[PDB]
Amino acid sequence: NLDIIGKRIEKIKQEHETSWHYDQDHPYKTWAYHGSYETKQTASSMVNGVVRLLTKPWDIIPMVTQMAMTFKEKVDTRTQEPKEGTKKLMKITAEWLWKELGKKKTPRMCTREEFTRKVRSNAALGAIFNKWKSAREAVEDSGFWELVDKERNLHLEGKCETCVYNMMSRAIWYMWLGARFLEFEALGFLNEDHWFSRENSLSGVEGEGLHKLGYILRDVSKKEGGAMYADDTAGWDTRITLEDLKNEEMVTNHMEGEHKKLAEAIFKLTYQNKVVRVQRPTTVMDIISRRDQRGSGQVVTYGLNTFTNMEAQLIRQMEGEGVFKSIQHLTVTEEIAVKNWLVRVGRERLSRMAISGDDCVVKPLDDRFASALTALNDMGKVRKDIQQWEPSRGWNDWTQVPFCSHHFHELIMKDGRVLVVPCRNQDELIGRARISQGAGWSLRETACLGKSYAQMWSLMYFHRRDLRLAANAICSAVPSHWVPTSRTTATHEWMTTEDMLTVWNRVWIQENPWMEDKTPVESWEEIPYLGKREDQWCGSLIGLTSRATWAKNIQTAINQVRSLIGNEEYTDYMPSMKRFRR
């Protein structure tokens, strides 16, 4: 308690000595409260006019238009301590999983150099407004690094002064850049060196890309076993126990020198003890602490979520296979059975899973998995939208399985080759493309964001008739040489000025390990769509009068946007589709 977080508390207390009160009508039950001080401020979703003007039929579809308008009583809940058999199952499994992830990887510090390059090409690292404006400025100034150095030597001493969270089913915890560097220096290796790649971790998909996830699910489908299970957890980040955070910290056992001490300090001082500053309307800043739940950078969060999800799902598999009999207590021969299962079949069992952070698909040995719920519930990984002891509903067809907000279609090209393509409800795709985040967008920047969506659609969703047509219209309405942009950057092969047919060929043919024949495609008309009825099922407007008028008059919509942007160089991409090819 206060010995580890006090220094951090004491510091904030002083900087607002003119305000510090122990407010008595404070909400917190599960968060420890420490005091308050005065503040006053709040970023809503702006519409991308370039995409909206070229998607007129969707102006009257509430599922699209409502997306652009507009649970902190789940962050204030508590998770019971797992039983002794559960804690033992997790410790054995975690120990074994780090060893296997570590067999072909070397833990190592990430550097100021690596950190700087990242800031100067815009990843959502999560810093704050103050002393320097943007992160881009602080990185170049030696002052910052002296701040970073003071804290760094403090961490080597087992103490912390400035590593404090800022709160804001979502709750994103920004830290100041300095503390972000210290987290990256010690744990960035997990992402930077691809510890959760499929090749390295067998269950993971880190770095895979949407054009790969469908093929991966189809490979899992080829295994002998039962249904495919894809149970979502209710508020995964809020269900991370202190026992979870202690099995995650066992990565430090693989480390040495400085690194081991620095990683140990991140885990002890910022993860297993946390200090947060929260905005309350009634408006003050609340300085609250707690030991458990997830609160890291979004990138370290992703890797430790994948690790702990891999661990949970191996254990649920162990329960289905009857490797242990009860979570109350493991016997001595049960420990040696668990260790032996891991050594004998652990890698084969990892390969039966696709795990992206809190998101999973498992193809277990058989359907005993569906009612193997005691360890899963006792670890606190409670399933969403199903009663706690009701057996899981599995999927019989890999093409029906939800994973990473998608499902996947099998699509045969007129030449017999097989594409496995990502898909989701088309209203969700159009609704998201019509939205921009943040202020001070020029017409040119708005156009270049619309071009990023259009190029993603040509690469990932070319099989949806409305999206191929709308993608061609947007790429026709935006100047040919203007570069696609995004403000929060998987693979992103659509972010380029290269010809989209050439990028399609590289992604889907040349570099696709599931495609044996490397014959390039010479036009978009060789590239197939879903069946007309399947396209409607997945939200296509084909068949509606609104959509026919839109398609027929598309050059008038393109010309409206060209007139707004002004006399620039434009390409007509509509003749890439047969109906506009005369």
Ligand X SMILES: CNS(=O)(=O)CC1CCCCC1
Which positions touch ligand X (CB under 6 A)?
465, 469, 532, 542-543, 551, 577, 579
Cβ-defined contacts of 495-499 (< 8 Å, 24+): 495/452, 495/455, 496/455
Q: Which residue is nearest to ligand X (CB)?
A: 465
Q: Is position 360 annotated in a ligand binding site?
A: no
Q: Which of 568, 482, 477 is nearest to 49 (CA)?
A: 477
What is the residue whose two structure tokens read 């039929």? Answer: 57
Distance, first Cα to last Cα, the chain: 74
Nearer to ligand X, 331 or 553 (CB): 553
210 lies in the binding site for Zn ion (CB under 5 A): no
358 in a known ligand binding site: yes
Q: Which residue has the tokens 């040119």?
A: 444
Least Å from the CB of residue 192 to ligand X:
43
**Contact partner, 108, from ligand X, Zn ion, none, Cβ < 5-8 Å per class:** none
What is the per-residue DSSP string for 203-250?
A: SB-TT--HHHHHHHHHHHHTSSSS-BB-PPBTTGGGG--HHHHHHHHG
311 is known to lie in a ligand binding site:
no
The secondary structure of 54-119 as a DSSP string is: T-GGGGG-HHHHGGG---TTTTT---PPP-HHHHHHHHHHHHHHHHHHHTT-------HHHHHHHH
Residue 532 interface partner, choices Zn ion, ligand X, none, CB cut-off 5-8 Å depending on type: ligand X
5 binds Zn ion (CB under 5 A): no
Q: Does 423 bind Zn ion (CB under 5 A)?
A: yes
Provide the mask over 370-409, with x wherever binding to Zn ion is found by CB under 5 A and - wherever it is not. Answer: ----------------------------------------
Rounded to the nearest 10°, the torsion over CA 19, 21, 24, 28 is: 90
Can you tell me the distance from the alpha carbon of 328 to that of 332, in angstroms, rounded to the nearest whole number?
14
Contacts for 253 with CB less than 8 Å, ≥ 6 apart:
98
Nearer to ligand X, 154 or 469 (CB): 469
Positions 305 through 324 that interact with Zn ion (CB under 5 A):
none
102: CB partners within 8 A, 6+ apart: 254
Per rule CB under 5 A, is residue 429 in the interface with Zn ion? no
Q: Letter for the amino acid at 581?
A: R
Task: Report the C-alpha gap between 240 and 145 in whole angstroms.
Answer: 32
Whichever of 311 and 535 has its CB closer to ligand X, that residue is 535
Segment near Zn ion (CB under 5 A); pick from 104-112, 142-150, 153-161, 331-339: 153-161
Interacting partner of 285 out of ligand X, Zn ion, none (Cβ under 5 to 8 A depending on kind): none
460 interacts with Zn ion by CB under 5 A: no
Number of residues forming the site for Zn ion (CB under 5 A)? 5
Quick one: 108 or 581, whose CB is closer to ligand X? 581
Residue closer to ligand X by CB (options 128, 542) is 542
| Residue 463 among known ligand-binding residues | no
241 a known binding residue? no
Which listed option, Zn ion, ligand X, none, makes contact with residue 262 (CB within 5 to 8 Å by class)? none
User: What residue 474 binds from Zn ion, ligand X, none (CB within 5 to 8 A, per partner kind)?
Assistant: none
Q: To the nearest whole angstrom, how small is the minimum distance from the Cβ of residue 579 to ligand X?
A: 5
Contact 557, 473 (CB under 8 A): yes
* Residue 262 engages Zn ion in binding (rule: CB under 5 A): no
Query: Is residue 216 part of the contact set for Zn ion (CB under 5 A)?
Result: no
Quote the CA–CA distance of 336 and 347 in Å, as a whole number: 17
| Torsions phi, psi for 167 (to 5 deg) | -80, 155
Output 228 or 338, the one with its CB closest to Zn ion: 228
Comparing C-alpha atoms, which of 74, 79, 77, 85 is closest to residue 374? 85
Q: What are phi and psi of 46, to 5 degrees?
A: -90, 150
423 binds, among ligand X, Zn ion, none (CB under 5 to 8 A by kind): Zn ion
273 is in an annotated binding site: no
- Specify the DSSP element, H or E, that contains 286: strand 284-290
Q: Running DSSP on this structure, what letter comes out for residue 382? A: P
- 170 known ligand binder: yes
Q: Does 160 bind Zn ion (CB under 5 A)?
A: yes
Residue 551 CB, nearest approach to ligand X (Å): 5
The reply to whether 538 sits near Zn ion by the rule CB under 5 A is: yes
Instruction: Please select the residue that binds Zn ion; options are 12, 139, 163, 186, rule is CB under 5 A.
Output: 163
Which residues have C-beta within 8 Å of that of residue 279, sequence separation ≥ 6? Answer: 39, 41, 42, 167, 168, 285
The DSSP symbol for 16 reads: T
Establish if 419 lies at the interface with Zn ion (CB under 5 A): no
The binder of 465, among Zn ion, ligand X, none, by C-beta within 5 to 8 A per type, is ligand X
Q: Known binding site: residues?
A: 151, 155, 160, 163, 170, 232-233, 235-237, 305, 358-359, 384, 407, 409, 423, 538
Which residues of the shown chain bind Zn ion in the complex (CB under 5 A)? 151, 160, 163, 423, 538
Q: Known binding site for Mg(2+): residues?
A: 232-233, 358-359
Q: Known binding site for Zn(2+): residues?
A: 151, 155, 160, 163, 407, 409, 423, 538
